[PDB]
Design a protein around this ligand. Structure first.
Ligand SMILES: COc1cc2cc3c(-c4ccc(-c5ccc(O)cc5)cc4)[nH][nH]c-3c2cc1OCCN1CCCCC1
Length: 254
C-alpha cells in the first residue's frame, strides 16, 4: 500500500508533536530528540494504563519515538485550581493510576516522575502513564536494587529521596501517587518539598488537617492519604494494601 509510512506533523503537544497518517488518518504522538535506555524501557511496556510505544526511527542525529496519542490531554488540565475535581472522577483516575503502577512495579520498572502533567487521558478518559525518560529498572533477575539518584519533581518526591543516601523504588512512586490524589481532590499541592524546613510539611506531620489542602478533603479519602503520606517509607502503605482501603473500594457516582 503506497504512502502508508508517511505522517503529517499537525501541531505541538509539549518536543512532542501530534502526527496524522497520510492514508489512514490515524493519530499518534511523535517525540523528537539516556535515549537508548528510554527506548529499551518503552519496548518492555504493554498495558492499558501505560502510553503505547509503536516504534522508533533514527534519521541521522534526530531520534523519532512513535507513541500513543491521548486526545483527552493531561490530567493536569482536569484539575481546577483550589478546587480539584468531583470525588468519583478522582477515585476512577486513581484506580487506573494504581493499575498502571502495579504493572510497572511487576515488571521491575519505576517511573520516578509521577505527576498530573505525565498522566494522559485517551478519547474515553482512560488514564495513561507517560514519559519514561527518568524511568529505570529496580528489579532484575528477581534481585531488587536500591536507588540513590535524585530524580523527580520536588512537590511530588518522597522525603527519603532528600534525607537518605539509598532508598527503595516502590514507596517513592506510591508517595507521588498520594500527592497526585491530593491535587485531584483539592486543586493544590500541599508543600514545595517534603522537608522539616517546610512549614506545610511540618503541619501535616503534626496532624493539622483543619488547614488547607486537607480541610477540603472528605474524611474517607483523607484516611487513605494519612497512610500514603507517611514519612518512613518502610511504614508507608503498599499498593496491595491501598487496594483494600475503605475509600478505594467505596462505590461513588456523581
Ligand atoms: C497539552 O495537551 C496535550 C499534551 C499531550 C502530550 C501527549 C502524548 C505523549 C507525550 C509523551 C510521551 C512519552 C515521552 C517519553 C517517553 O519515554 C515515553 C512516552 C508519550 C505520549 N500523547 N498525547 C499527548 C498530548 C495530548 C494533549 O492534548 C490533546 C490535544 N488537544 C488539542 C490541542 C491543544 C491541546 C488539547
Amino acid at each position: 500500500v503506497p504512502f502508508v509510512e508517511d505522517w503529517d506533523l499537525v501541531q505541538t503537544l509539549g518536543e512532542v508533536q501530534l502526527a496524522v497518517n497520510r492514508v489512514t488518518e490515524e493519530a499518534v504522538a511523535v517525540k523528537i530528540v539516556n535515549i537508548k535506555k528510554e527506548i529499551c524501557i518503552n519496548k518492555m511496556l504493554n498495558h492499558e494504563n501505560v502510553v503505547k510505544f509503536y516504534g522508533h526511527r533514527r534519521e541521522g542525529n534526530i531520534q523519532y519515538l512513535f507513541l500513543e496519542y491521548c486526545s483527552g490531554g493531561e490530567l493536569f488540565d482536569r484539575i481546577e485550581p483550589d478546587i480539584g475535581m468531583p470525588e468519583p472522577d478522582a477515585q476512577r483516575f486513581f484506580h487506573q493510576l494504581m493499575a498502571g503502577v502495579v504493572y510497572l512495579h511487576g515488571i521491575g520498572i519505576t517511573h520516578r516522575d509521577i505527576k498530573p502533567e505525565n498522566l494522559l487521558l485517551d478519547e474515553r478518559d482512560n488514564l495513561k502513564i507517560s514519559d519514561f525518560g527518568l524511568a529505570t529498572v529496580f528489579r532484575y533477575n528477581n534481585r531488587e536494587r536500591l536507588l540513590n539518584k535524585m530524580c523527580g519533581t520536588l512537590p511530588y518526591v518522597a522525603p527519603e529521596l532528600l534525607k537518605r543516601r539509598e532508598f527503595h523504588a516502590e514507596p517513592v512512586d506510591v508517595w507521588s501517587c498520594g500527592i497526585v490524589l491530593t491535587a485531584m481532590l483539592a486543586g493544590e499541592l500541599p508543600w514545595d518539598q517534603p522537608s522539616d524546613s517546610c512549614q506545610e510539611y511540618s503541619d501535616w506531620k503534626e496532624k493539622k488537617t483543619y488547614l488547607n489542602p486537607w480541610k477540603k478533603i472528605d474524611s474517607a479519602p483523607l484516611a487513605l492519604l494519612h497512610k500514603i503520606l507517611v514519612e518512613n517509607p518502610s511504614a508507608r502503605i503498599t499498593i496491595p494494601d491501598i487496594k483494600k482501603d475503605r475509600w478505594y473500594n467505596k462505590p461513588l457516582k456523581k
